[PDB]
């Protein structure tokens with residue numbers, strides 16, 4: 001008459017769904033394990049948060065996640081170059097479907113505006129950018145942000161809104177160039193995956209619409225989710 005899951009994972013599930021805890025965990029088809037806050041993994045992840053602040057974030061919990069057969073789906077793109085661990089932020093309500101059915105692309109038929117690099121899956125190298133999409137208030141100041149291994153390969157680098165139908169030949173992803181970027185010389189390797197956890201600096205990119213680098217992929221197989229973070233927003 002009890003759940004066998006760790007306490008933080010239980011608090012995480014009650015958060016997502018807003019009926020037995022174990023039954024709702026099974027609905028996700030995702031192995032959610034709590035990263036040790038002392039481990040090298042937690043230290044790098046917690047450093048990526050603090051360095052990419054430009055609304056201050058404390059890392060409550062770090063979960064190591066693995067959605068059913070997302071490995072298999074992504075295997076072709078695990079060969080690609082430029083694999084970066086990047087932020088995706090969404091409303092807490094959406095995380096039931098995300099972990100269930102992964103990150104998806106809205107259809108062209110479905111009306112869409114504010115999208116400035118077409119219908120794909122967007123990501124940030126700065127956490128304060130992805131955090132905005134959590135839409136957390138002082139009333140409920142806990143928000144969820146994903147870390148995903150995005151297989152970007154040859155990036156088609158734009159600095160102005162452009163509705164993308166198809167990528168130029170040889171390009172695998174789009175990268176919007178922002179006014180602010182992580183320090184290129186402070187980039188490290190986590191599992192052969194580039195983690196851009198340098199401090200926010202002036203990119204040098206002048207004539208740009210964007211304040212922050214956005215990364216977009218137009219194939220769901222190019223994404224392989226690694227970590228989910230539970231974040232307290234300090235106002």
Ligand SMILES: CC(=O)N1CCC[C@H](C(=O)N2CCN(C(=O)c3cc4cccc(-c5cccc6c5C=NC6=O)c4o3)CC2)C1
Nearest residue numbers: 087088089097103104105106115120121122123124130133
């Ligand atoms: C009914 C239903 O649930 N779904 C059918 C429709 C697709 C839903 C889904 O799976 N989605 C996941 C992928 N996604 C994005 O990636 C997306 C879009 C978009 C537009 C403007 C701006 C951004 C942005 C730009 C910088 C940074 C960040 C985002 C966002 N989170 C960020 O961290 C954006 O991202 C769309 C929604 C599932």
